[PDB]
C-alpha cells in the first residue's frame, strides 16, 4: 500500500554478501543536498510505498533520520555501471509549486568489477544526465564521487557534481531487496517522478553511457 512517508522504515545497510554488493558498498558516493528535501526511504521490506508530500519551503522533509540512498548494478557497452538513487518526498524547489515525489540517480562507471577503476560519472538532470569522462578528480573524494542536489530559478530540482563535500546514507541494493520491495517499485506509481533502477534500468544505463 501507499502509506505515510513518515511510516516507512529506514531500510539498514546490511553486510554486502557478494563481490557485486561489496563494490556498491565500496563506490557509494557523498550527496551535498544544496536545497530542497533530504533524502527519504521510498520503501519497506512489505513492499509499502511512500506517499510523498504535497508540493503546497521544505520544512516537512528534513529530517536527517531518514537518509536512505539505494543502488543496483550491471553492465553496458562492456562497462561496469553502479547506479545510486534518492527518492525525496517531494521536489521543493527555489521558485515554483513542484511536484509530490522525486527520484534522482547517478551512476558511476567502472572498467569491470576487478580493477574498479572509475571510468565516468553520470549525474540525472531533468530528461538527461550530466556526464564527466574522463571522471574530474575534483569531483572525487578518493574514490566517493560529490553529488549536489539543487534547484536554481527557475527550475525544477536536478543532480550535479561538486568539489564540495557531501553527506552518506545508508544504502539497500535492488539486489539485496525483498521480492515484495523490488514488485512495488516495479509498479508504483510516482506521479511526475520515476524509479530510475526497475525494469527501466537498462534504458537508463544506455542514456547515461559517455559515448
Ligand atoms: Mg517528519
Ligand atoms: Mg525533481
Redesign the pocket.
Known sequence: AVIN??AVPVWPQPEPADATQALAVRFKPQLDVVNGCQPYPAVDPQGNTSGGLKPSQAA??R?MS?AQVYSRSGTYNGYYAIMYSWYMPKDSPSTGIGHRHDWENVVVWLDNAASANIVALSASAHSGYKKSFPADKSYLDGITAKISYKSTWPLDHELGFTTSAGKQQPLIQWEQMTQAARDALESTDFGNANVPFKSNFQDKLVKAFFQ
Open positions: 512517508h513518515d516537512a522533509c529530517d531518514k
